[PDB]
Write a protein that binds this ligand. Structure first.
Ligand code: CRZ
Length: 131
């Protein structure tokens, strides 16, 4: 994946509070996270992909190789087992913790980067555009 490379700003978000709630995010965290308009910076150095998220809420960063499981501390402080693959141009990211699972799909659509977050019956869609 490298059509994903760049700096991306959040411009729209749907159902993100519902999603965080379903994931188990406490109210105090949802409040600040929900108002957040993060900048997402994606870069690639060989087989290592780095995704940063910067906002007044929290700075986070993951570095990974496609198809190799890694430990992630999420923005909401979950300790999860993450695996990311590239599937028909789609970056598919699964987080597993406590017998639960959530999926984040990042895809390129026109000049948008579209992020779909799924937890149980809840689907949240977030759109980023180049900074
Ligand atoms: O990438 C996204 O836009 C949503 C998935 C990752 N993510 C955040 C990104 C920016 C700000 C807060 C959060 C957040 C909060 C809880 C869980 C996942 C989260």
């Amino acid at each position: 994946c490298d059509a994903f490379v760049g700096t991306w700003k959040l411009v729209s978000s749907e159902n993100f509070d519902d999603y965080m709630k379903e994931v188990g995010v406490g109210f105090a965290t949802r409040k600040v996270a929900g108002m957040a308009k993060p900048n997402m910076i994606i870069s690639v150095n060989g087989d290592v992909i780095t995704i940063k998220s910067e906002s007044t809420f929290k700075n986070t960063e993951i570095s990974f190789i496609l198809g190799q499981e890694f430990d992630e501390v999420t923005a909401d402080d979950r300790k999860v087992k993450s695996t990311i693959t590239l599937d028909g141009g789609v970056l598919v990211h699964v987080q597993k913790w406590d017998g639960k699972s959530t999926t984040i799909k990042r895809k390129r659509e026109d000049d948008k980067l579209v992020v779909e977050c799924v937890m149980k019956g809840v689907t949240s869609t977030r759109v980023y555009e180049r900074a």
